[PDB]
Design a binder for this molecule. Structure first.
Ligand SMILES: *[C@@H]1O[C@H](CO)[C@@H](O[C@@H]2O[C@H](CO)[C@@H](O)[C@H](O)[C@H]2NC(C)=O)[C@H](O)[C@H]1NC(C)=O
Ligand SMILES: *[C@@H]1O[C@H](CO)[C@@H](O[C@@H]2O[C@H](CO)[C@@H](O)[C@H](O)[C@H]2NC(C)=O)[C@H](O)[C@H]1NC(C)=O
Ligand SMILES: *[C@@H]1O[C@H](CO)[C@@H](O[C@@H]2O[C@H](CO)[C@@H](O)[C@H](O)[C@H]2NC(C)=O)[C@H](O)[C@H]1NC(C)=O
Ligand SMILES: *[C@@H]1O[C@H](CO)[C@@H](O)[C@H](O)[C@H]1NC(C)=O
Ligand SMILES: *[C@@H]1O[C@H](CO)[C@@H](O)[C@H](O)[C@H]1NC(C)=O
Ligand SMILES: *[C@@H]1O[C@H](CO)[C@@H](O)[C@H](O)[C@H]1NC(C)=O
Ligand SMILES: *[C@@H]1O[C@H](CO)[C@@H](O)[C@H](O)[C@H]1NC(C)=O
Ligand SMILES: *[C@@H]1O[C@H](CO)[C@@H](O)[C@H](O)[C@H]1NC(C)=O
Ligand SMILES: *[C@@H]1O[C@H](CO)[C@@H](O)[C@H](O)[C@H]1NC(C)=O
Ligand SMILES: *[C@@H]1O[C@H](CO)[C@@H](O)[C@H](O)[C@H]1NC(C)=O
Ligand SMILES: *[C@@H]1O[C@H](CO)[C@@H](O)[C@H](O)[C@H]1NC(C)=O
Ligand SMILES: *[C@@H]1O[C@H](CO)[C@@H](O)[C@H](O)[C@H]1NC(C)=O
Ligand SMILES: *[C@@H]1O[C@H](CO)[C@@H](O)[C@H](O)[C@H]1NC(C)=O
Ligand SMILES: *[C@@H]1O[C@H](CO)[C@@H](O)[C@H](O)[C@H]1NC(C)=O
Ligand SMILES: *[C@@H]1O[C@H](CO)[C@@H](O)[C@H](O)[C@H]1NC(C)=O
Ligand SMILES: *[C@@H]1O[C@H](CO)[C@@H](O)[C@H](O)[C@H]1NC(C)=O
Lengths: 390, 380, 227, 196, 98, 49
């Protein structure tokens, strides 16, 4: 009853419009919709040691390696530049506000319920309910700030890949901004947009009641403000439902954060291949430096050691080149997120399809491991009726 | 060291990665099996009846202490031509088994005893595998293996249906069938005896005189060792960084007891790096784990060199509250010993800092150390 | 008589003598293909089966019916030949130029200077009952001289056609006969469901190692597109 | 293909090449990633509409003549007159979806570069979207902007006469709509010439 | 070349050649990557000149901080400098609203 | 292969292998760079549409 079938893909549904000389369709209702957008911002910082990777605890191999000039100062410089760029990437996205704002003790904003996005005091980390599912659905291989050394010897069982990488000179560095003061930046950004509108992104922050700010936001898309006040309560409900079902659609889906996991997977796979490449002969007697040294006299062991050196240098240069290309891609994707934060969050955007689908009203930021998540609140038309026009 | 790494006499403000620190070994140990016999080479080289090439003689060598330097006075050979292992480095290895093959050939055929050769000897008489690991020894024997009337005591195979496989013997006296008529032992027209006589005379010039040949084949693989060179065995030390020479396998590290389950035919252990992980002691038959020496990265935090000469040192991702790597004399590679600064040691999520005191105020970040920790040059 | 049966996943041995744990090593060597045809014979004569690329031998005997095996070419007094005749307590592996027996398993020795003796290969046990029909598996190959033999006795089997599962083989001995082997034969006595034969082929396998250093599973790489 | 490019139908070269580790799984992975990215590039540009719209049978839009851009039913490929002069002025070396193998042997004359590349292990793959359903996407995009304005990019499509949409477009740049209606015919001409 | 005969100087010369070719390929690759980065940064400047200078920009934080009014271009070695004139609010007072 | 015995043909075959591997790596690297450029130019077209 089950089989494999082949077909021709369909472009989509079919629809036809009723264009006529004097006929216009006008909507009579509306919907408030909340979508989500996920953007990578940074990648993992790594460092490599040539002497330990190429010539493990050997003096003859080191003396031979000194004869190749500066083919290892260059790799170190490239990796350091990549690491510093990664540190600078997260400063532009999040550090957009000079000050730190706080929410009032009493939280009543005309009916709108911001419980799912405001920080939770009960949790020790002071993170939103929505930014706890984002932090549990992405699993980092190495955080970096672990000081793991001291237990690789006592693993007893098959040592994990991390110890194998560490013993060969490949290490991972911790980010400068801990993922506890990034959440403080997000809280400051989000607490100054629901108590002051967009005024805090230009000059001093000026307070304003939330319903009047919403009236301004409607007026900015071509609908008069009296529409909001006469339909305030209803609109609030349509917002509260919209948030209520964005958590569930993330909590039960298999993998929605597929953009923020591919980075981790790629970096881990690259390091694993770099480690596995050590057990290759490259056309020599053996792949172990302490074996060809103990079976041949010094004059003719130099040829084999040279083969190993010239294989491993290329094996490492390929890695650094691919890292440079990936870093450039991540930098572009982080510049996009910085622009999106400046335009969608600290203001209202008139560009089509930039800040979500529909007519843009608001946006809220959240932080995820190595990335950012935008909640775009937009206005969609509804039930439409035919009319005759002149 | 910072001024040396980047070639200048002046250093700008920042943090620089200089080098790594390592812990040096303090002792050396050697472990070889428990054997004392002296297995005979004098019964191979010193003989009278070296066999024919087509039926070459093979002898197997077993538990003994081999010494490949007392065999230089057994034959006028000028030198050993060796393929897998250098002849000089033969007294420091342990082999599972050794095979000695002896025969006699002509001079100009001596070049045929080598991997990947072709001829009348490497095809129907004696073949060596392409991955040979061992040595050959050939020397002239015109004084013994020659006669005025000829020496018709050595024979060699001349005709065979197909080429031999390596290390294969083919003693058989059939009648070759080279033609159409299936001869039944007449050995007449178009049917020859496969073996040809190989007569020798003292008048023949070099390259037509007998040459006595003996080849030694070793087994440099992973198995219990049986034939070893004459090196003494020291004691065993654990939980201390040392240099080890376990049965010809040399290295450095820390040796500790093991929970692994080596089977009786197992002898070594490996992780996914093509490097050894655990070793079985030759005289104790207990499993030992090998762990690399303690190492780490060192960074130097300095203000501008035109402001002050003071620095701070960051040891990257170490527990210096427990691993301060404080040494005496020669036990560690960066030899400056910046330690003993009093209450000026800090433990950061990115390692640990020596030479800077932690204040409990907050300022703008000047020099990024990491994990939310910065450092700066300030007044008192 | 004789018939054909399926081998399932059966006949995997340890490629080398290195301990490994929690890995997915892949080895290219002589192996018995998965889901192949093994010839199951009966006894009540004793055909000279061909030998090539090694042979996998399986038997399910009550106590003992099989003494040993004979190797060589033309099996006569003109070429050298092996003898692995077993004993109550020993093994008489030797290489010689035996002449015949046509039923001691030889008449005379012409040019014979090789012998070897060690512990017996066959080991059996019973829990005070003969229902523990232990299955003995052997693998023979002749790569570059150096006759290799692997073996394993699995006493957990009950036996109807061939066990279903997975198991491994451990080496016994390596020894330099240095002869040409083409034919094969079996030696078995009389009395007062077993003897399965299969042939090995050069194949690539991907083996999965346990946390205790044993081999738990293996996948062939020339059987299916999925494999 | 590494094996065919480096060591052509040789076993010794293959055995030597196995000794260099995984220097060919990496190249294959890189090329596959590039190919998948190329397939994803054309989906973002064109697949902007969920549905497929169609033009009305009668084509009178107040004077504006869209003949040069709407699909041509007479042509088998259903492509605009302008989208043909662009498909004839660019000549692809290898389309990919040709299954060329079978005639390299019978070329008789000097074999073309394509056969020389093919015999050495270099191949070209065909795109997932044929250049016949890309034109359908373009037709859907263009037929929903002249019958509904910009409304179909936000929510449901809402029809509106073309002159009123043009009046809205003028009003959006700071010119009152009465300028269009009093100069409608003239404007139409200036459009028809501009396309022409 | 002046210490070895032609047959066995070729090995040494081949070593030198194969070292220097790699030494030069690394340079050209890094140059290509840097050129791509500079091209992106120049496209951004072209857009900024078209939007800030030849018009008034409504995008937030694009043409300087505050409410954008004007922009003036200047040329520097291998680069451009923008002077953004913006309007910032000032002394604010509380009020009651309905 | 048909002019030298197996022991000393391996050197020549190794030379050929190590030349062709580099010849192919250069191609894949340039392809990666060009693909990144095309991706940027396609993102621009998506925004413009
Ligand atoms: C516009 O749409 C909303 C939501 O569909 C309508 O509100 C619903 O009204 C019905 C009947 O009054 C109730 O049963 C639903 O519970 C309402 N929904 C919500 C979310 O409160 C609203 O009536 C529509 N407006 C018009 C004019 O039809
Ligand atoms: C705002 O939203 C929160 C979250 O949905 C509401 O809190 C929930 O209220 C329901 C109904 O009483 C309870 O069943 C849930 O257990 C509550 N969850 C949490 C996390 O408190 C809250 O009632 C809403 N209104 C406010 C805060 O005024
Ligand atoms: C719309 O434009 C088309 C294309 O220019 C016009 O069709 C052309 O009309 C002229 C004048 O009659 C002919 O000479 C051409 O041969 C026509 N070309 C084609 C391709 O049909 C058309 O008349 C214009 N007006 C409409 C369609 O109402
Ligand atoms: C719209 O008006 C034009 C011009 O009179 C006419 O040709 C066309 O048929 C009209 N549309 C409909 C649907 O009748
Ligand atoms: C580092 O030292 C602290 C303090 O003793 C200890 O709690 C922690 O477990 C240590 N970490 C490691 C990896 O040994
Ligand atoms: C408007 O009229 C057309 C033609 O009669 C019809 O197809 C369309 O469904 C109508 N619109 C609505 C909203 O009913
Ligand atoms: C073997 O050694 C003995 C004693 O040293 C010597 O007399 C004899 O000549 C030797 N044989 C040969 C063939 O050199
Ligand atoms: C073994 O004998 C067979 C049969 O004569 C023959 O085909 C084969 O070549 C022989 N093997 C060797 C290595 O000579
Ligand atoms: C080594 O052999 C000698 C001689 O039999 C014995 O006395 C000694 O105990 C042995 N040592 C070990 C460690 O087996
Ligand atoms: C100073 O910092 C230490 C560090 O924990 C803290 O215990 C102490 O309370 C702080 N005191 C003041 C006055 O800030
Ligand atoms: C075994 O041989 C029979 C023929 O007797 C054949 O039909 C069957 O397919 C073979 N088994 C396999 C697994 O190929
Ligand atoms: C079998 O073993 C016994 C004792 O081990 C011995 O006496 C007898 O000769 C052996 N027979 C054969 C055929 O090996
Ligand atoms: C085998 O032994 C017989 C008996 O003397 C002898 O004639 C013959 O030469 C021998 N053959 C070999 C190859 O030793
Ligand atoms: C390994 O052996 C231990 C006995 O110490 C056992 O508990 C464990 O289950 C074994 N591992 C597996 C995978 O069965
Ligand atoms: C492929 O087969 C079809 C059907 O016979 C034929 O029309 C076409 O010419 C073939 N293509 C090639 C390249 O041989
Ligand atoms: C407005 O009133 C609040 C509360 O009384 C006060 O904190 C704030 O400073 C006032 N604003 C100004 C500009 O004085």
């Amino acid at each position: 009853s089950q089989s494999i079938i082949a077909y021709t893909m369909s472009l989509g549904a079919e629809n036809s419009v009723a264009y006529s000389n004097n006929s216009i369709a006008i909507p009579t209702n509306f919907t408030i919709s909340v979508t989500t957008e996920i953007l990578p911002v940074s990648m993992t910082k790594t460092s490599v040691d040539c002497t330990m990777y190429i010539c493990g605890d050997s003096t003859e191999c080191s003396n031979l390696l000194l004869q190749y000039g500066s083919f290892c100062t260059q790799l170190k410089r490239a990796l350091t530049g990549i690491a510093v760029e990664q540190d600078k990437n997260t400063q532009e996205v999040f550090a957009q506000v000079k000050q730190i704002y706080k929410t009032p003790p009493i939280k009543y904003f005309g009916g709108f319920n911001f419980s799912q996005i405001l920080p939770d005091p009960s949790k020790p980390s002071k993170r939103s309910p929505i930014e706890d599912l984002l932090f549990n659905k992405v699993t980092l291989a190495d955080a970096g700030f672990i000081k793991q050394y001291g237990d690789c010897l006592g693993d007893i069982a098959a040592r994990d890949l991390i110890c194998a990488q560490k013993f060969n000179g490949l290490t991972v560095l911790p980010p400068l901004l801990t993922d506890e003061m990034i959440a403080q930046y997000t809280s400051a950004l989000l607490a100054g947009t629901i108590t002051s509108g967009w005024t805090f992104g230009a000059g001093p922050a000026l307070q304003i009641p939330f319903p009047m700010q919403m009236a301004y936001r409607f007026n900015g898309i071509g609908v008069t403000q009296n529409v909001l006040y006469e339909n305030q309560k209803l609109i609030a409900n349509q917002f509260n439902s919209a948030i209520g079902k964005i958590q569930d659609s993330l909590s039960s889906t298999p993998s929605a954060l597929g953009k923020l996991q591919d980075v981790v997977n790629h970096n881990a796979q690259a390091l694993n291949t770099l480690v596995k490449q050590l057990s290759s002969k490259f056309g020599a007697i053996s792949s172990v430096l302490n074996d060809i040294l103990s079976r041949l006299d010094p004059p003719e062991a130099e040829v084999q050691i040279d083969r190993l050196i010239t294989g491993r240098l290329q094996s490492l240069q390929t890695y650094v080149t691919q890292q440079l290309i990936r870093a450039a891609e991540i930098r572009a994707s982080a510049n996009l997120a910085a622009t999106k934060m400046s335009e969608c969050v600290l203001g209202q955007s008139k560009r089509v399809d930039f800040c979500g689908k529909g007519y843009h009203l608001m946006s809220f930021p959240q932080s995820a491991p190595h990335g950012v998540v935008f909640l775009h609140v937009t206005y969609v038309p509804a039930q439409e009726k035919n009319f005759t026009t002149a | 060291e910072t001024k040396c790494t980047l070639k200048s006499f002046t250093v700008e403000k920042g943090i620089y990665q200089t080098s790594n620190f390592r812990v040096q070994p303090t002792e050396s140990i050697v472990r070889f099996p428990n054997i004392t016999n002296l297995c005979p080479f004098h019964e191979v080289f010193n003989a009278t009846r070296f066999a024919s090439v087509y039926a070459w003689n093979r002898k197997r060598i077993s538990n003994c202490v081999a010494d490949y330097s007392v065999l230089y006075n057994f034959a006028p050979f000028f030198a050993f031509k060796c393929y897998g292992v250098s002849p000089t480095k033969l007294n420091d290895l342990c082999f599972t088994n050794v095979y000695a093959d002896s025969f006699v050939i002509r001079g100009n055929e001596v070049s045929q005893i080598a991997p990947g050769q072709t001829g009348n000897i490497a095809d129907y008489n004696y073949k060596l595998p392409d991955d040979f690991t061992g040595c050959v020894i050939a020397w002239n024997s015109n004084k013994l293996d020659s006669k005025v009337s000829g020496n018709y005591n050595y024979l060699y195979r001349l005709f065979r249906k197909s080429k031999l496989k390596p290390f294969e013997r083919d003693i058989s006296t059939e009648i070759y069938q080279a033609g159409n008529k299936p001869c039944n032992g007449v050995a007449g027209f178009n049917c020859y005896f496969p073996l040809q006589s190989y007569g020798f005379r003292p008048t023949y010039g070099v390259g037509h005189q007998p040459y006595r040949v003996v080849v030694l084949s070793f087994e440099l693989l992973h198995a219990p060792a049986t034939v070893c060179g004459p090196k003494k065995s020291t004691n065993l030390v654990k939980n201390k960084c040392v240099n080890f020479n376990f049965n010809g396998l040399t290295g450095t590290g820390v040796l500790t007891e093991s929970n692994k389950k080596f089977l009786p035919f197992q002898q070594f252990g490996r992780d996914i790096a093509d490097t050894t992980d655990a070793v079985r002691d030759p005289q104790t038959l207990e499993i030992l784990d090998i762990t690399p020496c303690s190492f780490g990265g060192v960074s130097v935090i300095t203000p501008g060199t035109n402001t002050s000469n003071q620095v701070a040192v960051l040891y990257q991702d170490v527990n210096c509250t427990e691993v301060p790597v404080a040494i005496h004399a020669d036990q560690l590679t960066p030899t400056w010993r910046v330690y003993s600064t009093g209450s000026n040691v800090f433990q950061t999520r990115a390692g640990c800092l020596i030479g800077a005191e932690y204040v409990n105020n907050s300022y703008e970040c000047d020099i990024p150390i990491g994990a939310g920790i910065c450092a700066s040059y300030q007044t008192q | 008589t004789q018939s054909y049966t399926n081998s399932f996943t059966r006949g995997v041995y340890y490629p080398d003598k290195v301990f490994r744990s929690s890995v997915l090593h892949s080895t290219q060597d002589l192996f018995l293909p998965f889901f192949s045809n093994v010839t199951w014979f009966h006894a009540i004569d004793n055909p000279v089966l061909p030998f090539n690329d090694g042979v996998y031998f399986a038997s399910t005997e009550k106590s003992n019916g099989i003494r040993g095996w004979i190797f060589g070419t033309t099996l006569d007094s003109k070429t050298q030949s092996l003898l692995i005749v077993n004993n109550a307590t020993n093994v008489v592996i030797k290489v010689c130029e035996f002449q015949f027996c046509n039923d001691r398993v030889y008449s005379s020795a012409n040019n014979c200077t090789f012998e070897y003796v060690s512990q017996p290969f066959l080991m059996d046990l019973e829990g005070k009952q003969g229902n523990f029909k232990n299955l003995r598996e052997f693998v023979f190959k002749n790569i570059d001289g150096y006759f290799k033999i692997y073996s394993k006795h699995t006493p957990v089997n009950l036996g109807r056609d061939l066990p279903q599962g997975f198991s491994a083989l451990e080496p016994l001995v390596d020894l330099p006969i240095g002869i040409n082997i083409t034919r094969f034969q079996t030696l078995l006595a009389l009395h007062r469901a077993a003897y399965y034969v299969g042939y090995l082929q050069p194949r690539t396998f991907l083996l999965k190692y346990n946390e205790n250093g044993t081999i738990t599973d293996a996948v062939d790489c020339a059987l299916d597109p999925l494999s």
